[PDB]
Point group: D4
Chain length 150, copies 8
């Protein structure tokens, strides 16, 4: 893609509901050309889709947690554990990272009780788990994963 695509994405990452006319005027290109470029970005897998940004508080998601999960070595324990973690309701992020050489799991729940029942108790029952450390998020300074172009 080119610089024009980047300018388009820079806008769509923040507000996908801006009419074509508005965007066409901002970047200075024919509306039909804008539409074409957008359709091409979607087809090329650049734009994966469009989502509504919902306020977690509105859904009473008050118990936010980030958990480190260490896996037992051998067989295929690591890859398997990653998959089991990602299937847990409430879990939106699962990453394997170097340094701690383990999984970092991002999740959201309405209450401590839900967290315990849906997440912790389930993870505690997984035998290939060596250790876990749950950091309770008590403050979200910033959370805009949608912003990929600064």
């Amino acid at each position: 893609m080119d610089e024009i695509d980047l300018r388009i994405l820079k806008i769509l990452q923040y507000n996908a509901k801006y009419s074509l006319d508005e965007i066409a005027r901002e970047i200075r290109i024919p509306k039909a050309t804008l539409s074409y470029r957008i359709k091409k970005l979607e087809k090329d897998g650049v734009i994966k889709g469009y989502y509504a940004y919902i306020n977690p508080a509105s859904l009473n998601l008050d118990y936010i947690v980030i958990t480190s999960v260490k896996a037992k070595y051998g067989k295929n324990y690591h890859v398997e554990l990653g998959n089991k973690l990602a299937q847990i309701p409430g879990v939106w992020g699962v990453y394997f990272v170097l340094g701690d050489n383990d999984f970092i799991v991002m999740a959201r729940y309405k209450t401590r009780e839900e967290f315990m029942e849906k997440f912790l108790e389930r993870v505690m029952s997984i035998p290939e788990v060596e250790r876990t450390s749950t950091q309770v998020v008590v403050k979200i300074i910033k959370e805009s994963p949608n912003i990929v172009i600064f």
Copy 2:
């Protein structure tokens, strides 16, 4: 909000581009009523906006990191540090968590070089930082922060 709003949000969290007709049919309610409910959710701050989901790889964001930053105690060092972290280009998430009682910073860069120049070198220059630990994400098992209703 009610159960109907929840069903609507459950759809919009995945695809905000579904025509009203389609959604109206799925949930079984008048199109005008659907439109009204959606407009009300936006006005009540439930739906904060609509974003395009862009594939990080398409932008060559190959260097993904999660960093723990500990702050010096006293004065207003903690709150201040949180703000400085959130302003760094590439940083999309900043949280203060219990357990490690520190900040967890999510960021994305194209290369090691960019990470060093834009993030690490900047953080290294902040005196109220006591310690930092950067975990290099080498595998994204799952990352769907948009999914708030499972």
Copy 3:
């Protein structure tokens, strides 16, 4: 309950032996009404009971310890371990906490010898224990678990 119940509890948490007359005068309500309110709090499970506060030193409880116990993952090891810990003579507090994601055990003994025989040796024999760390309390700055209303 109401504000009056709170004022009553604020007194009973410190001294349950204050005559009804005295309390009735302090909060300014009929003695019969005070008695009724207290009886209602006990019946509603707010007031669980009344205890004598005994000075641990008077019983030569000189060896005070706080131990972190990590459990093996899988099966029902975690819940089971918690129960085994709480049954040990001398143990008055057992909590499962996030962060270290393990159990914190509060106990009191007369001497190192008793601690070893009654607590440590018993815990050491439990196979589902992964690690333990005993912090020896050498100074009790404050310990008033009875104070719930500040």
Copy 4:
């Protein structure tokens, strides 16, 4: 004190509201003698007082925390910090322990918000604090500090 005093304390630690007659019958001694012995225990500082046991949940104390606080060395930082910690509303226990060679603080709050405002923010402002680690209690297996005679 003697064995009889111990039997008396073993009862009073659980229920201080048992009439003298009842206790007199259980331990087999004259009521007047029981009353005398109890009065003597109070005078000798063995029985410090009588408290009502209030159910924390009844007061919505849902955010329970245990925090480790490390102090800077030198001057009188350690002793001073201990005192500052014990004065924080919600804090019921403060201990200095060996091993981690730091303070362990027990506290209770109604919500995350109260915890942050009353405890964490206050501690964060104390300059002689080197590090803190807050363990969020998500399960109280046992908490009977009143039981000193097993």
Copy 5:
């Protein structure tokens, strides 16, 4: 024992080769009485024996190490491990300590090679060992275990 015994021990802890006459004069008591008191201390198990203090360097004991050894929980692993550690040639001290809740082993060897062959390789072969951490002593500021009376 009394104050006189203490004065005698204070001398014998440093130099057991001081003639009776000399000690008798220093503490001001009959020589026969001194001899008697010393014989009594040996008989009562206070004085366990007399040793020559040999300079480790004279024996080329250049590789001094302090190792922490963690044991697996369950069965009698802990007590057993302690015994196995104490039997290793070169090991002069074995302690079980709280805090790290493990064994601390003091040993001396002539070279890295001897340390590896006699100690490390042997410990590495013990299955009930969970972890070990060997601290290499590069400086002996003080080592006078014989001094028990300051």
Copy 6:
């Protein structure tokens, strides 16, 4: 020195009170030659002296501790701290070790109170101390620093 000196030291390390005749017979050499060799070892600094081995329990030394002390970097803080540690009454061993790159301090006290007053409180007042960790020895499996020849 030679093999004969080693055999002599192997005996003196355990019992310095064995008459010359006895040792002369065991190793098979003239008594006068034994005496000469011993005198030479003392003169050459091999045998530093002779001590009485006193049972710590006999002196009620019930509070045994091993503490790790980390020093601030810069100036001459490290060397200085080592000296301050070695001068504390009760401290018999002070070592600087690699790995943790800090000081390990061995000490003995009669009670927790003495430990606090004589050791901990003093160390807490030293500003160049960065961290300390005191391991409470609850079991002495072996402690024979006098044995240098196995």
Copy 7:
């Protein structure tokens, strides 16, 4: 070897392509004598060989890592693990160290992907591995293992 050999090695460690004449002049000795001394050093195993120093960047070796690998205790797990680590393509250094009492592995790869496929995934499949921690090298301040004479 002597001082002259050392001067020769001091040169060869930096540049093995200096003609004999040049070296002969610098150190002031007959060329034939220089050649002889060099041949003798090679024969005595002092000079193991001559290598070309290749710039890692020229080969796109952009992913540099240093990993700590802990081994399970018992049997011959430790020695065996060391050998398995050293056989992994990309691994140039494997050391067993005290302190962490584990293996430190130095390796180089072109990309994160290669690192994952050739190193991490392979190590993850080894059952006798207890833990691993990979430090991502983001800056090579100095790397001149060839310099042995300063």
Copy 8:
């Protein structure tokens, strides 16, 4: 460069003293062409130079260490510390790594004494050092930094 250059480098990384004829025969290309390609690699900075591989033991380099050094945050402490570390005699490798987010220093000395005098004492005097951890290498399983093509 091409595949032929790679084959040439694969040989030169192990033995830079192979005559041109030998290499020319192995890879199957004109000797003059081989010479040209090698000269081009040197000119393009691919081949930085040629070194003699000296056996560390031959120089009595028996004390091998790997040290982690943490730097204070702020100003230019980090970059500056890296430079100071790399200038220490005996230090051949200095890297800044993520995970521990600190410096890893590789060094070699003949004895503990030299290590202390040349390295440790010098580092201890640097005020911007927050912590250090020296791992003593007691076994070199593999060390072939020259091998860049496997």
